[PDB]
Amino acid sequence: VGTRWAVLVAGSSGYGNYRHQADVCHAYQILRKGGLKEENIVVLMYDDIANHPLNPRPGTLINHPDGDDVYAGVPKDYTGSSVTAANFYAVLLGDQKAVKGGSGKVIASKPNDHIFVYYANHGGPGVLGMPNTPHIYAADFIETLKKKHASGTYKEMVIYVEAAESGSIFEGIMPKDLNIYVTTASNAQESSYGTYCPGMNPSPPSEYITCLGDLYSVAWMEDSETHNLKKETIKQQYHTVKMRTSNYNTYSGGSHVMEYGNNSIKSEKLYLYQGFDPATVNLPLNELPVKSKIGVVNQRDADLLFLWHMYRTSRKKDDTLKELTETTRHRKHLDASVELIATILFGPTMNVLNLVREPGLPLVDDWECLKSMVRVFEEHCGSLTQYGMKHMRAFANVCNNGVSKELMEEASTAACGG
Ligand SMILES: *[C@@H]1O[C@H](CO)[C@@H](O[C@@H]2O[C@H](CO)[C@@H](O)[C@H](O)[C@H]2NC(C)=O)[C@H](O)[C@H]1NC(C)=O
């Protein structure tokens, strides 16, 4: 007879990343309808979307083309500059003192309690995005889970992670004895996908020129809201989500949903974590959920999709056209910087830094070195940005190949100085 807790985190901001905060708000409504209490649900979101100037319906958020508002009622626990990696860890550990700013709500859980964690944004190999730097590094996240387990302040925990290369956050480092079960949107090397976007099928209402959701996220949320959670197992949800996210085993506009931690937890019913909604119990015959294939966009290209459609539907015309050209060239400049550093170190052909480790291995052996090499890069080449998280394997392999900090500095200066 425990208490059910939850942490909902959006790791991004900006109207181009509408979907991520819409994902989280939708997740909150599902938990509330299921009977979870607001005091037991901590929400971390930048909160810049609902009243964004570009929002055609101010004060609302939708996570589906024909969907209703999901923004109303969502608590403002940690918004704006308080959405940090440090606050996320502190909330999860339930240490109210370590929290800086915000409402001060934390997961002060007890040994018999259940915890549900859901992250949604951007990502890269070994890294999860945050709207305020520094980003989340996998080792710090796993270590936080270890301390939480050591305190023994929970019975079991389930974690859902929506991000690109999200499997890399847990592979090679996530233990199976922490009473934690984890699912991720993709494996350690592949892209994730956003959905309900303009120019595709299905599309949002024409006034929306940005993506409403993400494939993996809307997969489990639409699943939970249309099924009896007293009957459905975690095992069944994983199976359904994996199938939809893979675009039904075609992997064309789809990714590989991965799982980590203790798999025996999968036998349990979803209501122990997500609550139970009586409305879903014995639905009439003609209202049973029927799912079909949906168009998607690469998670890292959803930004460009937003800028291009805003250009098409439009002096705001060229302000957007100019922002499109500048964004494109900034990304290519950043790609060139990483490529040049790799080329300087190990050459332009069969570059050793581009080698992907076998499934099951950790991305990097020295995680503190990974942080260090990123700082060196940013000191010379400028901020890596959330887009630049795609290049994180290059920095990881610099550490794995034992390249010293001095040589990285030398290569970074030659590549970006001037
Ligand atoms: C993996 O998770 C299970 C629970 O799903 C942990 O618990 C075992 O299963 C029964 C279920 O009632 C418990 O009462 C026992 O205490 C556990 N038995 C054994 C043999 O473990 C299980 O311990 C977890 N495994 C690990 C390695 O932590």
Residue numbers in the entry: 48 to 361, 366 to 469
Give the exact sentences the study uses for this entry.
To understand isoform-specific differences between different AtLEGs, we determined the crystal structure of seed-type proAtLEGβ to a resolution of 2.0 Å. The asymmetric unit of the tetragonal space group contained 12 independent molecules. Like isoform γ, proAtLEGβ comprises an N-terminal caspase-like catalytic domain and a C-terminal legumain stabilization and activity modulation (LSAM) domain with death domain-like topology. Overall, the structure of proAtLEGβ closely resembles the structure of the homologous two-chain AtLEGγ indicated by a Cα root mean square deviation (RMSD) of 0.49 Å. Similarly, in the crystal structure of proAtLEGβ, we found all twelve independent protomers in the crystallographic asymmetric unit to engage in symmetric dimer contacts, which were mediated by LSAM–LSAM′ interactions. In contrast, the proAtLEGβ dimers in the crystal structure were predominantly mediated by the α7 helix. This interaction was formed around the symmetric H384β (H392γ) and further stabilized by one symmetric salt bridge (E390β–K383β′) as well as by a hydrophobic contact of the α7 C-terminal LFG motif (396β-398β) with W355β′ centered in the α6 helix. However, modeling a proAtLEGγ-like dimer uncovered repulsive charge densities of α7-α7′ helix contact residues in AtLEGβ (R380–R380′, K373–K383′, and D369–D386′) that will prohibit this γ-mode of dimerization. Together, these findings suggest that the observed β-dimer is weak and probably only transient in solution. Comparing the crystal structure of proAtLEGβ with YVAD-cmk-inhibited AtLEGγ, we found that the AP binds to the nonprime substrate binding sites in a substrate-like orientation, similar to what we previously observed in mammalian prolegumain. Gln346 is binding into the S1 pocket in an unproductive orientation and thereby preventing cleavage of the AP and further blocking substrate access to the active site.
The plant cysteine proteases of the legumain family (C13 family, EC 3.4.22.34) have an important role in processing and maturation of seed storage proteins within the vacuole and, therefore, are also referred to as vacuolar processing enzymes (VPEs). Plant legumains are structurally related to the mammalian caspases and exhibit a strong substrate sequence preference for cleavage after asparagine and, to a lesser extent, aspartate residues. Seed type legumains like Arabidopsis thaliana legumain isoform β (AtLEGβ) play important functions in the processing and maturation of seed storage proteins within storage vacuoles. Structural analysis of plant legumains showed that they are synthesized as inactive zymogens composed of a caspase-like catalytic domain with AEP activity (AEP domain) and a C-terminal death domain-like prodomain (LSAM domain, legumain stabilization and activity modulation domain) that are connected by an activation peptide (AP) harboring the α6-helix.
